[PDB]
Each structure stands twice: as structure tokens, then as C-alpha cells.
Amino acid sequence: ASEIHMTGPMCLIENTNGRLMANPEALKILSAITQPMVVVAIVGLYRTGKSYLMNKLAGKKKGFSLGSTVQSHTKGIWMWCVPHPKKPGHILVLLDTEGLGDVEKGDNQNDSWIFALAVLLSSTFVYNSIGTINQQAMDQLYYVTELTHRIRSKSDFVSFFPDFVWTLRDFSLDLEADGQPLTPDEYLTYSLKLKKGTSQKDETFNLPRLCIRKFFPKKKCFVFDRPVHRRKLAQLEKLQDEELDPEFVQQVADFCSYIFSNSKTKTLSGGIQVNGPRLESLVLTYVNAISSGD
Amino acid sequence: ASEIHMTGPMCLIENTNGRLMANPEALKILSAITQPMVVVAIVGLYRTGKSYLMNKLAGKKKGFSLGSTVQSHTKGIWMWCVPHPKKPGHILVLLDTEGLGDVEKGDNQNDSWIFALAVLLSSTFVYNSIGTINQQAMDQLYYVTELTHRIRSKSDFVSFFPDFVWTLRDFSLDLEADGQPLTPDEYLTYSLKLKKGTSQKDETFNLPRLCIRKFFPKKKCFVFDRPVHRRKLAQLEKLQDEELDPEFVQQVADFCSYIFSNSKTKTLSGGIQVNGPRLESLVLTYVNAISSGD
Ligand SMILES: Nc1nc2c(ncn2[C@@H]2O[C@H](COP(=O)(O)OP(=O)(O)NP(=O)(O)O)[C@@H](O)[C@H]2O)c(=O)[nH]1
Ligand SMILES: Nc1nc2c(ncn2[C@@H]2O[C@H](COP(=O)(O)OP(=O)(O)NP(=O)(O)O)[C@@H](O)[C@H]2O)c(=O)[nH]1
Ligand SMILES: [Mg+2]
Numbered sequence: 001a002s003e004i005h006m007t008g009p010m011c012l013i014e015n016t017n018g019r020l021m022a023n024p025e026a027l028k029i030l031s032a033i034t035q036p037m038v039v040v041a042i043v044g045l046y047r048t049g050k051s052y053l054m055n056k057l058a059g060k061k062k063g064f065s066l067g068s069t070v071q072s073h074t075k076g077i078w079m080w081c082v083p084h085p086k087k088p089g090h091i092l093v094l095l096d097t098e099g100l101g102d103v104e105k106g107d108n109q110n111d112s113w114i115f116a117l118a119v120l121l122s123s124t125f126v127y128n129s130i131g132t133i134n135q136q137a138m139d140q141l142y143y144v145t146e147l148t149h150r151i152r153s154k155s156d157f158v159s160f161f162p163d164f165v166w167t168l169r170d171f172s173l174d175l176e177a178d179g180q181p182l183t184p185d186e187y188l189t190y191s192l193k194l195k196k197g198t199s200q201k202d203e204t205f206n207l208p209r210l211c212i213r214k215f216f217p218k219k220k221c222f223v224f225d226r227p228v229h230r231r232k233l234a235q236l237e238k239l240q241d242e243e244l245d246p247e248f249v250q251q252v253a254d255f256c257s258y259i260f261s262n263s264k265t266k267t268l269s270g271g272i273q274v275n276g277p278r279l280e281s282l283v284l285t286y287v288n289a290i291s292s293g294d
Numbered sequence: 295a296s297e298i299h300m301t302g303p304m305c306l307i308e309n310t311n312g313r314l315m316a317n318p319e320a321l322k323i324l325s326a327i328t329q330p331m332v333v334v335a336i337v338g339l340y341r342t343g344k345s346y347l348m349n350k351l352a353g354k355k356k357g358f359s360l361g362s363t364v365q366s367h368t369k370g371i372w373m374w375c376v377p378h379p380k381k382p383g384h385i386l387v388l389l390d391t392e393g394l395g396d397v398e399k400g401d402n403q404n405d406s407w408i409f410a411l412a413v414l415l416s417s418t419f420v421y422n423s424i425g426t427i428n429q430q431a432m433d434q435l436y437y438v439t440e441l442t443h444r445i446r447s448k449s450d451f452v453s454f455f456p457d458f459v460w461t462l463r464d465f466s467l468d469l470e471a472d473g474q475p476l477t478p479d480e481y482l483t484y485s486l487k488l489k490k491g492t493s494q495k496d497e498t499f500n501l502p503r504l505c506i507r508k509f510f511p512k513k514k515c516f517v518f519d520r521p522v523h524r525r526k527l528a529q530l531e532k533l534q535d536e537e538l539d540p541e542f543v544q545q546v547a548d549f550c551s552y553i554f555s556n557s558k559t560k561t562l563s564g565g566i567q568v569n570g571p572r573l574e575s576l577v578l579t580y581v582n583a584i585s586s587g588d
């Protein structure tokens with residue numbers, strides 16, 4: 001219940017050589033926080049600005065470490081526990097994950113794990129991508145959703161599955177379909193729109209769109225214009241809202257507000273609300289669930 | 295051999311309901327061109343600026359139709375035959391393809407076909423993506439490379455496989471790995487870098503990197519900064535190099551020069567150089583090869 005005590009992030013799960021390992025020092029910290037938790041994790045391709053956006057949710061210009069090269073930067077899964085801006089006695093647990101698709105690691109399977117863990121530990125899951133919603137992205141989602149079930153196994157009065165938010169970065173297109181205007185949320189609905197008919201494939205189509213809309217209780221989508229611009233992008237955290245594109249600042253604001261006011265408390269199947277100790281448990285159960293027996 | 299006769303693009307292959315169909319009117323045109331051909335096709339996720347870049351290679355501000363919404367724009371495969379800027383008596387055949395990953399079509403298989411056809415018809419294959427080289431992208435490549443073999447079947451003194459170029463759009467990162475500077479070409483080499491060791495997986499890793507470097511004779515990579523900027527992006531073809539970011543204009547120039555001077559003439563397995571009639575044949579052989587018998 002302590003006083004705003006987490007200066008910066010800390011690796012919660014280590015990722016070395018295809019070996020995900022819970023970090024004791026973080027687990028030691030979780031066992032200390034007894035307040036209920038609102039966990040928010042982000043996931044998406046590497047080098048898509050995930051950490052930078054996760055900081056905005058912490059209200060600090062500095063926090064989750066960024067990188068400005070073509071090389072994967074955030075490794076494993078990081079946690080940052082901070083007082084909840086809108087819920088007293090609540091703890092906002094921010095989770096930053098290792099980017100997907102790094103061509104130096106080239107480990108689809110290893111990605112599947114981090115991705116899955118993130119969904120398993122969140123109460124609000126944020127899927128971050130550039131420009132648009134892709135089928136490939138939407139397929140990866142579906143796969144991990146299923147992979148998430150398998151994992152739970154080796155471990156319907158109001159679920160405990162995470163709410164969902166899809167973030168679109170450096171957006172640069174009109175955002176309108178079939179001559180008729182769209183809002184982020186509608187665009188996301190449009191992409192998950194089921195196929196009115198039937199067919200061997202006319203169904204293999206909406207198959208994922210079913211599970212995705214079923215798995216994630218609530219959905220939401222936010223668009224984000226490219227922060228500042230080329231040349232200033234490698235120094236984004238120093239620059240203040242002044243030098244940044246207004247549109248973005250607004251987009252970030254509206255996103256944080258959405259999160260601060262709608263992200264639910266993490267609850268275990270049974271209704272029990274998740275807190276430091278219970279979260280520390282979930283990790284171990286899952287990390288150990290992963291690895292070892294298939 | 296006629297006088298610079300192809301005002302604008304024309305659909306070479308139609309894509310309706312999982313049905314790829316060669317367009318007679320284009321085939322009628324191919325049978326007319328008797329000059330040797332340098333075919334250059336682009337492929338990549340939808341809404342990544344492919345058509346806009348393909349026009350630069352035609353030297354016209356107008357040409358392949360663009361679209362500025364979240365909706366897939368170019369459908370099927372388009373062709374544009376134009377006089378070769380650097381090779382007399384040569385015909386530069388530009389191929390624009392239907393973007394990948396459109397969440398409205400949601401047809402991975404259908405994508406695989408267009409992607410494959412493009413590689414089969416090109417002498418220079420251009421893979422276009424945003425920001426960086428992804429593993430997912432690099433996997434899709436490998437898959438189609440193999441799928442390309444299967445198709446040939448249902449149909450080593452200096453090959454006839456296409457040369458390769460990877461284009462990076464709206465690039466915005468430093469471009470340097472392991473503290474030591476990189477050039478596009480090195481970055482692409484870095485991503486295809488094989489694993490010095492062995493292991494069940496220490497090999498499943500460089501497996502695609504083998505086939506990819508084996509399949510594509512010559513490789514090349516070009517980076518491109520975001521053309522103009524947000525707000526002007528939906529009108530890119532009207533704006534002239536003036537309003538555009540210099541860096542880009544230069545990048546486009548250097549790309550076109552590379553293509554105009556290194557893209558080889560299309561040759562059939564046997565050494566025979568491909569011309570209008572022979573190309574018209576390849577299409578039919580492949581379209582008909584695809585569809586029908588698995
Ligand atoms: N073009 C662009 N760059 C951004 C954006 N946000 C941050 N950046 C910059 O891109 C670089 C990487 O940002 P970062 O937040 O680390 O992205 P990441 O997804 O966490 N990288 P990784 O997945 O490897 O950990 C930094 O220079 C950062 O300032 C954005 O929205 N668009
Ligand atoms: N952000 C960004 N936009 C671009 C770029 N090039 C073109 N655009 C704009 O993005 C929109 C689509 O461009 P287009 O060339 O049609 O892309 P495409 O890949 O051919 N689309 P599709 O694959 O669906 O046919 C247009 O408004 C175009 O002006 C670019 O390099 N970056
Ligand atoms: Mg990061």
C-alpha cells in the first residue's frame with residue numbers, strides 16, 4: 001500500500017536463449033503490493049513505438065527504455081507499478097513487451113510465448129501496429145488467443161478475459177470505407193465484420209473474427225499520427241508536447257483517458273480480484289506452465 | 295516495336311472471387327510487342343505506396359491508380375509496358391500488384407497466388423514494406439519462393455530467377471546495428487545473415503535465409519523517407535518534387551537509376567529472352583497452372 005513506489009520499469013520476465021524466466025527481484029516486489037491491480041500490456045511488431053506510448057500511461061517522459069535503431073530494443077516483459085490516476089487504492093500495472101518479428105532473433109515460437117503471456121496477465125490488452133489492421137496481424141492474434149487457452153488448461157457469469165484495444169501508429173490514410181466515413185472503433189468493427197454467408201472458406205474467413213470478438217469482452221481502437229517528425233523521432237522523450245504534432249498529443253490524451261477510466265481490475269477465474277501476490281503467482285504458474293511439458 | 299505505345303496501366307490478371315483470370319485485352323497487347331523485356335514487379339502489404347513508387351519507374355506523375363483510404367486499392371495484377379530508359383529496343387514492363395493482408399478480403403491463399411505470380415513474371419522482384427524488415431515478411435517470402443517451385447513443376451548454367459530488391463518506406467530509424475553503421479544493402483545482408491552454428495532450431499532459423507539468398511541471384515535494398523507529409527499524402531501525385539521532402543526525391547532517383555541500369559532481361563529456363571508473345575504465354579501457363587489441379 002506504500003507511497004508511489006516504483007521509480008522506473010523492471011524486467012518481470014527474462015528472455016535469454018528460448019528461456020523465459022521470471023525475475024525474482026520483481027516477484028519480490030509484487031508480493032509487497034497488496035492493492036488491487038489494473039494491468040495493461042502492449043504487444044506488437046518491434047520498433048513500433050510501444051514503450052514510448054506505455055510511458056504516456058505512466059505520466060512520465062522517461063520510463064520504459066526506448067531505442068532508435070533497426071535493432072530490437074525491449075527484451076522480455078517489463079513491469080511498472082504505479083498509483084492509479086483514477087482509481088484510489090488501485091495499482092496501475094503497466095507491462096511493456098519485447099517487440100515481435102525481430103529478424104535477428106527469428107523465433108516465431110518465442111514470440112508466441114511473450115505475446116501469450118501478455119494477454120494472460122493483462123486486464124486490458126493493447127495490440128500496437130503501424131498504419132493499418134492487417135490480416136497477418138489479425139491471424140497472429142487469433143492463434144495466440146487459442147494458444148492462450150491451451151496454456152490455461154495446463155494450469156459464464158461475467159468473464160475474466162482482457163478487454164481489447166488496437167492502436168494504429170503513424171496513421172496517414174483517410175480512414176473511410178465504402179464511400180462512408182469511419183471512426184477508429186468502426187474501422188476496427190469493419191475489419192472484424194463477419195461474412196453474412198457460408199462456405200468451406202466463406203467461414204474459414206470469419207472463423208478468427210469469431211474467436212477474437214468472443215475472447216475480448218470489450219473492444220476499442222485509437223489512431224495516432226506520427227509523433228514529431230523524422231529527425232526528431234530518435235529524441236522523442238526529451239522533446240515536450242510543444243515540439244510535438246498537436247494531433248498526436250490529443251490522440252495520446254484521449255487514449256490515456258480511455259485507459260484510466262475503463263480498464264477493469266484484473267480478476268482470476270472465480271471473481272477474485274488480482275493483487276501483487278496473486279499476480280506474482282500467475283506469472284510463475286504461466287512461465288513454468290510454458291517451457292517444460294509441451 | 296511501335297512508338298512508346300502504352301498510355302497507362304491495364305489489368306493483366308483479374309482477381310474476382312478467388313478466381314485469377316488473364317485479361318484478353320492485355321494478352322492481345324503482349325502478342326504485339328516483339329522487343330525483349332525487363333519485367334519489374336512490386337509486392338507487399340496493401341496501402342504501402344507500391345503503385346506510387348511504380349509510377350516513378352515509368353517517369354510519369356500519373357499512371358498506376360492510387361487510393362487514400364483504409365480500403366485495399368489495386369486489384370489483381372496490372373501491367374504497363376514502356377520504352378526502356380537505358381536499353382534501346384528494350385521494353386520495360388512494370389507490374390503493379392494487389393496489396394497483401396487486406397482485412398476485407400481475408401484470403402491468405404489468394405494473396406499467395408498474386409505474390410507467386412509476380413515473382414514468376416519478374417526479372418527483378420520488388421518487395422515493399424514499411425519501416426523495417428520483419429520475420430513475418432521474411433517468412434512469407436520464403437513460403438512463396440517454395441510455392442513458386444511447385445507451380446513451375448506443374449508446367450545450373452546461369453539461372454533465370456529474378457533479382458531482388460527490398461524497399462523500406464517511411465523509414466524513420468537510425469539504421470545501425472551493434473554500434474556499427476549500416477547501409478541499406480548491409481542491413482538487408484544483416485537480416486539474411488546465417489546462424490554460424492547448428493541445432494534443430496539453430497537451423498530452422500537460417501533455413502529460409504538459405505532459400506532466399508539462393509533463389510534470388512542478386513539482392514539490393516533501398517530506404518525511403520515518408521514522401522511529403524501527413525495531410526498532403528492523399529494528393530501525392532499532383533504535388534511535384536518541390537513540395538516533397540528532398541531526401542525522398544533523392545531516394546527515389548537512386549532507386550530508379552539502380553533499376554534502369556541493373557534489371558536484367560526476362561529469360562526462360564533455356565536462356566531464351568522473354569518478349570511480348572513469350573510473356574503472354576507465361577501468364578496463361580501460370581494462371582491456368584494455378585486454379586484447377588491443386
Ligand atoms: N515513427 C515513429 N517512431 C516512434 C514512434 N514512437 C516512438 N518512436 C521512436 O522509435 C524508436 C523506438 O521507439 P520504442 O518506443 O522503443 O518502440 P518499441 O516498439 O518499444 N521498440 P521495441 O519493440 O524493439 O522495444 C525511438 O526512437 C522512439 O522515439 C512513433 O509513433 N512513430
Ligand atoms: N505514408 C505514406 N503514404 C504514401 C506513400 N506513398 C504513397 N502514399 C499514399 O498512400 C495512399 C496509397 O498509396 P498507393 O501507392 O496506392 O499504395 P498501394 O500499396 O498501391 N495501395 P494498395 O496495395 O491497396 O494498391 C495514397 O494516398 C498515396 O498517395 C508513402 O511512401 N508513405
Ligand atoms: Mg520497447
Ligand SMILES: [Mg+2]
Nearest residue numbers: 344345367368
Ligand atoms: Mg496499388
